[PDB]
Symmetry: D2
Subunit: 265 residues, 4 copies
Amino acid sequence: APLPQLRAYTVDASWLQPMAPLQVADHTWQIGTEDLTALLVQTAEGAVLLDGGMPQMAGHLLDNMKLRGVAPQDLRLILLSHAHADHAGPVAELKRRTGAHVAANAETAVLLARGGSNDLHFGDGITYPPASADRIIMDGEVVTVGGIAFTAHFMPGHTPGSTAWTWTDTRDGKPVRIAYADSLSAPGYQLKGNPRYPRLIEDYKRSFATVRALPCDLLLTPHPGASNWNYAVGSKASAEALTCNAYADAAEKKFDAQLARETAG
Amino acid sequence: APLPQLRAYTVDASWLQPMAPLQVADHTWQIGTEDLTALLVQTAEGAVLLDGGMPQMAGHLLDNMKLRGVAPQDLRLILLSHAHADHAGPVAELKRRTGAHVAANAETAVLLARGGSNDLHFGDGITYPPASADRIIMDGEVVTVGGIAFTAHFMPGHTPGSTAWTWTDTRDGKPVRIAYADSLSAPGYQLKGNPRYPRLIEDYKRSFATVRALPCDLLLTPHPGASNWNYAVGSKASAEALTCNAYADAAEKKFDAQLARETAG
Amino acid sequence: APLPQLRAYTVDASWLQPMAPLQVADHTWQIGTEDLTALLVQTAEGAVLLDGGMPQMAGHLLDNMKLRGVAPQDLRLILLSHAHADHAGPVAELKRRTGAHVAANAETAVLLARGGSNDLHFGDGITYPPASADRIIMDGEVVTVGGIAFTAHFMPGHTPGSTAWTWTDTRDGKPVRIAYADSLSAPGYQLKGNPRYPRLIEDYKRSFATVRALPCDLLLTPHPGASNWNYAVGSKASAEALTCNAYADAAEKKFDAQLARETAG
Amino acid sequence: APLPQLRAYTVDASWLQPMAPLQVADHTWQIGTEDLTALLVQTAEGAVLLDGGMPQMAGHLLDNMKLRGVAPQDLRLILLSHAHADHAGPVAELKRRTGAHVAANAETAVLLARGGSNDLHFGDGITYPPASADRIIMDGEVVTVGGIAFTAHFMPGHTPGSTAWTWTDTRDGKPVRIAYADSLSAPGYQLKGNPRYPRLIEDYKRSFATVRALPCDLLLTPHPGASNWNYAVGSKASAEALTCNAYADAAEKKFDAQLARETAG
Ligand SMILES: C[C@@H]1[C@H]([C@H](C(=O)O)[C@@H](C)O)N=C(C(=O)O)[C@H]1S[C@@H]1CN[C@H](C(=O)N(C)C)C1
Ligand SMILES: C[C@@H]1[C@H]([C@H](C(=O)O)[C@@H](C)O)N=C(C(=O)O)[C@H]1S[C@@H]1CN[C@H](C(=O)N(C)C)C1
Ligand SMILES: C[C@@H]1[C@H]([C@H](C(=O)O)[C@@H](C)O)N=C(C(=O)O)[C@H]1S[C@@H]1CN[C@H](C(=O)N(C)C)C1
Ligand SMILES: C[C@@H]1[C@H]([C@H](C(=O)O)[C@@H](C)O)N=C(C(=O)O)[C@H]1S[C@@H]1CN[C@H](C(=O)N(C)C)C1
Ligand SMILES: [Zn+2]
Ligand SMILES: [Zn+2]
Ligand SMILES: [Zn+2]
Ligand SMILES: [Zn+2]
Ligand SMILES: [Zn+2]
Ligand SMILES: [Zn+2]
Ligand SMILES: [Zn+2]
Ligand SMILES: [Zn+2]
C-alpha cells in the first residue's frame, strides 16, 4: 500500500460563486464572491483591498476592480482579517499584478510567508501561495490611503494574527463607522491545554470584548453568514446584519458550548 | 457557474510506494520510494539527506533513518537537486523535526521559499510547504560533513537552480565517485522565446556538457528511471544504470526532438 | 556640505569585556561579557543559548562553549530576550557556525529578520546582521531540549517581541526556578500617543504584572545591572540580585517617572 | 582588553555630495550624488529607479524625484546593479516610502535580504538595512514600465548577482541605447581558489565579454569614474565617457594585473 495522495482544499460552491460589485457605502464595495468577503475601498489616491478570498479569485477581483474604474496598478494596499487560504488565498498573485503593498501584524505576516503551512491547528492541510508583508502593523495603528484612515484592532483566537479593521465612510451624507471584524470560529480546534497555543482561551475571551467595543455602525465579516449578510440580495444584503455586540455574543456562546463539549469528551 | 475548485498534485502510485533502505555504497543509502530518490549519507559526525521526495514522505524518511541508526537530531544537512514538489516536498517538515540546515544555491533558495509557487512553467499548479535555505552555495563550492566532501555543479534548465551533487564514497575497499545529477526533462515547457526564461535553451545545452564532465563512477537521478535504476530489485538495482555521458546524451536527444516539435507546431 | 557619514553602534567597554564561564546553577552558565548576559544551558542532548550579546561576540561565545565541553555542532537552540543589536547581535553568525535553530515569537522573528532595522524607536540607528527564526513560539509555549523545559512568557514593551524565559535547574540537589526576564527600559522612547506603538503604555503595564508573577527563585536580566548582578565577582555575583517582584517594581517606578516627565515637557 | 567596537562604513565625501538632477536623455536623469549613480527614468505610467547609492541618500533621492515632478507614490519599480551598501543602501526605506517593487535576480535578492551581511568577500564589514525583492528576474528578461522596456544582462563577478540594465531612450529625436553596466572591480578579493566563489575568474571573464556585446550608444556605471563620467560638469558630464568595449577592456586589464599580482604574492 503506497503513501496517500495529496488532497485539495475544496469548499462550497457559493464560496466560489462570483458576484458583481455590491456597494456597502460611498467608497466601499464588496467585490468577492457570494460567500467570501473582499472589500474594495476607493480613494482619491488609489484603492485598498481588505481580503481576497480563495487563491483562484485573483482574476475575478481584478475584473471587479476594473468595473469600478480601478486599474491593477491603482491598488495601493492589501489588508487582511487573517491569513488562511479562503481569505488571503490570492494575495501573492495580486501583489505581482498590482504592485500593492501588504500591511499586517507580525503574526499574520509570518503565517502568510509560510503560505498557511504549519498552521497551529490545520498543519499543512490548507495552504496557499506564500506572500510577504511589506509593512508590519501594531495594535491600534492607523493606516491611511487617500485620506481614509484604517485602524487595526487585534483580536487573536481564530488565528494569532486575527485583526479587525475599522474606518469611517459615508452614505451619501452621513458618516458610517464600518467594522470589518475577523472570524471568531474555532473549527475543530483543541481549545484547552493546546501546546501550540497555550493561551488560546484567554485570547478568544479578550477578543470577544474587543469586538464588543469596536466603533461599529455597520459590521461585516470574512464570511457574510457570520454577521448575517446576504450578498445575493443586493440592496437588501445588510438588512438583517448583526451588530458588533450581537456578533461577539453569539460567537462567545458558540465558543463556550464547544469548550464544554471538549471538556466532556 | 462558480469558480473551479483547487486541484491536488497527484502522482503515480509507485512515486509513493515506500521501500526499505537500499545500500548504494558504504555510507550512501536510497531511503525514499521505489520511484523517487532520497539519498542518506551517514558520516561519523551526522547524516546528510539529498532530496526528500513528496511532501507526505517526511515520516517515511525519518522511519528509514531510524532503521539506519540515525535519530532525527542526527540529520545535519539537507541538499537538493531542484525545488519542485516531488523532490523538495517534505523539506520544511524535516527541518522542523531534525534541526537540519538546508544548503542550496540562490535560485533553489528563492523557489523553495515560495513553496514552488509562481513556477516559471507550472505557475501555482504544483506547490508544497515553503522552506528557507540556511546556507547559500556557489557553483563548485564544497560542503563537508563528517569528512565527506559534497561538491555542487550547477546545471540549470529543468529549474534555474538545478544542481548536481558529487561525492566519493567507497564500496568495501575501492573509491566510488557518485554523481547525483538533476533532472533534464522539460515537461510541457515552452523552450523557445520564453519571456520568463529567455536563455533556457542555452542553459540546457551547457548543462548537458556539465553532466558529461561530472566525476561519475555511479550515476543516480531524482527519478530512478531517468538513469535506468530499478530500486525494486535490491542488489541488482544499479545493474543497467546509465553513465553520466549516456544520461546527458539521451536527455539532449529528447530535448532536441521536443524543440523541433515546438518549432513545428 | 555632503551628506553625513554612517555612525557605528558603540557601547561601553564593559559590554565588550570578555569573561570566563560563570556557573549559575548545575546546567546553566553565564558565558557572555561582564556587562551582557549570554546564558548557556548544557543538557544530555545538546546545549541551549539564551542571548548572544553584541555582533562581535560570536567567537568569544564559541570559545566559552568549548571550555564547557560544548562543540559548535552541539548547540541545538538559540533563545532570545529581544532582538536588539546588543542581545541578538551574533545570532546569524552563530547559526552558520553551529547549525542551531532559533526559536522566537512572531514579533521577535520579524525584527530579527530585519537585522533590527526600521526599529519602532531607533529607526536604522542600531542594526546587526539579519537572522531568521526556525520555530515560532506562542505565549506560554514550552520548548524542551535534553529534557529541560523552557517556557516563554511574553512581556512586550521594550520591544513588541520581548520575552521572559523560565526553566527549573538544580543547585547540587535542590531545584532552582530560573527566570531570565527581558529588559523593561524605554530608552528615549516616546511613550504616549506613539503612532508606531499605540498601546505601548498598556503593554508595559501588563508586562510589569507578568514579571511579578514569574516562577522565580533566581532572576537574571540581559543587562546584569538591571537585576543587580555583578558578573565580575564570581561566586558572589548573584548575592545582591533582585527578586522578580523588586525588578518589576523598580522598572515600573522608573517608567512612571519617565511618563510624567514626557507629559511635562 | 575588551572586544573591539563596531566600525562604521565611511566613504569619500564626494560619494555623499548631493547634486541636482542631471539629464542623461529625454526620460533618464542622474539624481544621486556626484560620485554615486542613481538613475531615474520617468514614464507616462510612473518612474523607475536604477540604484539608490548609500543608505543615507533616501531623502535626497525623494527630493530630486519631487523636483522632477515625481511624487513618492509615483515610483513603480527599483532596479539594481548589485546589492552592496553604496548602491542598494536606501532600498528598504525607499520601498516603505514609495510602495515601489524591487525586481532583481535570485543572487541579488538573497544578498539584499541579508542587508549585505555574510558577503562572500566583505563578511559583515559593510551592511545596510535588508530589503526583499518582489519580482525575480532571469537573464535577458524584459521589465516594462510605461512602455519603456528594461532588459537584464547578468554579469557576475563583482557580486554573483551583478547585472547590467539596458534600455532605449531618445535625445530629442533620435534613439539612444543606454547601457547601465555594473561594476567590474574586485576590491581586495581573493580571485584564485576562493572556496566561497570557486568559479569567480570564469565569471569575470565571461562578464567582460557580456559587457563588450551590450547595446550601448551611451554607457553609465554605478561609480561615474568607472566609465569616465564627471557628474559635476553638467552638460559636459558624458563628454569623455568610455564605450562599453573600452570599459570592459580596461576592467579586464586591471583584473589580469591583479590576478598576476595575487599569483605572485
Ligand atoms: C472552517 C471555516 C473556514 C476555514 C477557516 O478559515 O478556518 C477555511 C480554512 O476553510 N473559514 C471559517 C472562518 O470562520 O473564517 C471557518 S468556520 C465556517 C465558515 N462560515 C460559517 C459561519 O461563519 N457561520 C456563522 C455558520 C462556519
Ligand atoms: C513531469 C515530471 C515531474 C514533475 C517535475 O519535477 O518537473 C513534478 C512536478 O511532477 N518530475 C519530473 C522530473 O524530471 O524530475 C518530470 S519528467 C518524468 C519523471 N520520470 C520520467 C523520466 O524521467 N523518464 C526518463 C521516463 C519523466
Ligand atoms: C539603551 C540600552 C541598550 C539599548 C537597548 O537594547 O535598548 C541597545 C540598543 O544599545 N540596552 C538596554 C536594555 O534595557 O536592554 C538599554 S537601557 C540601559 C542598559 N543598562 C542599564 C540598566 O539596565 N540599568 C538598570 C542602569 C540602562
Ligand atoms: C571598493 C569599492 C566600493 C565598494 C564595493 O561596492 O565593492 C563599497 C562596498 O564600498 N564600490 C566599488 C565598485 O566597484 O562598485 C569599489 S571599487 C572603487 C570605486 N570607484 C573606483 C573606480 O571605479 N575607478 C575606476 C577608480 C574604485
Ligand atoms: Zn480561518
Ligand atoms: Zn474562512
Ligand atoms: Zn522538477
Ligand atoms: Zn520530478
Ligand atoms: Zn533593547
Ligand atoms: Zn540592551
Ligand atoms: Zn560593490
Ligand atoms: Zn561601489
